[PDB]
């Protein structure tokens, strides 16, 4: 049993030049494929773009699910964020259906560690 939810979108350093949205990734599981049984970590969209690219580089012909993308339609910021949230949740759901993508150490550090993306990358490049 694996329950993965992308939840509670929030604006970080709000009212500032470098404000951005990140998303809470809730993972609960009874599988020791994970080092922790409950995790919460916050990830921003550009971190997901990195993860998709790092998964492709390690997975050979195993197909990596698509990220939602950018819309060509104005709406509310609220409806855009909600469609994106749904796309990030579908992406993680489909990742976690592959034995091969599940085995990837970069996926485990993304979902269950507080390591930044350059620190995760430095761990793999540094052995
Ligand atoms: C870890 C260092 C990353 C670095 O600073 O680069 C980021 C840079 C972003 O430039 P760009 O290629 O335009 O990519 C943008 C960022 O990924 C941004 O992520 P975030 O800031 O929310 O996390 C999205 O919100 C934005 O979506 P939208 O346009 O509003 O629909 C997207 O276009 O380009 C990319 O990483 C390629 C993404 C396709």
From Swiss-Prot:
Domain of life: Eukaryota
GO biological process: intracellular protein transport; vesicle organization
Gene name of this polypeptide: SNX11
Name of the protein in question: Sorting nexin-11
Subcellular location: Cell membrane; Endosome; Cytoplasm
Job of this protein: Phosphoinositide-binding protein involved in protein sorting and membrane trafficking in endosomes. Regulates the levels of TRPV3 by promoting its trafficking from the cell membrane to lysosome for degradation.
Annotated family: Belongs to the sorting nexin family.
GO molecular function, one term: phosphatidylinositol phosphate binding
Domain PX, chain residue ranges per copy: 1-117
Ranges that cross the membrane: none
Region (Important for membrane trafficking): 120-124
Keywords: Cell membrane, Cytoplasm, Endosome, Lipid-binding, Membrane, Protein transport, Transport
GO CC, one annotated term: cytoplasm
Native organism: Homo sapiens (Human)
Binding site for a 1,2-diacyl-sn-glycero-3-phospho-(1D-myo-inositol-3-phosphate): 44, 70, 84
Oligomeric form and interacting partners: Monomer. Interacts with TRPV3; this interaction promotes TRPV3 trafficking from the cell membrane to lysosome for degradation.
Comment field on protein domains: The PX domain mediates interaction with membranes enriched in phosphatidylinositol 3-phosphate.
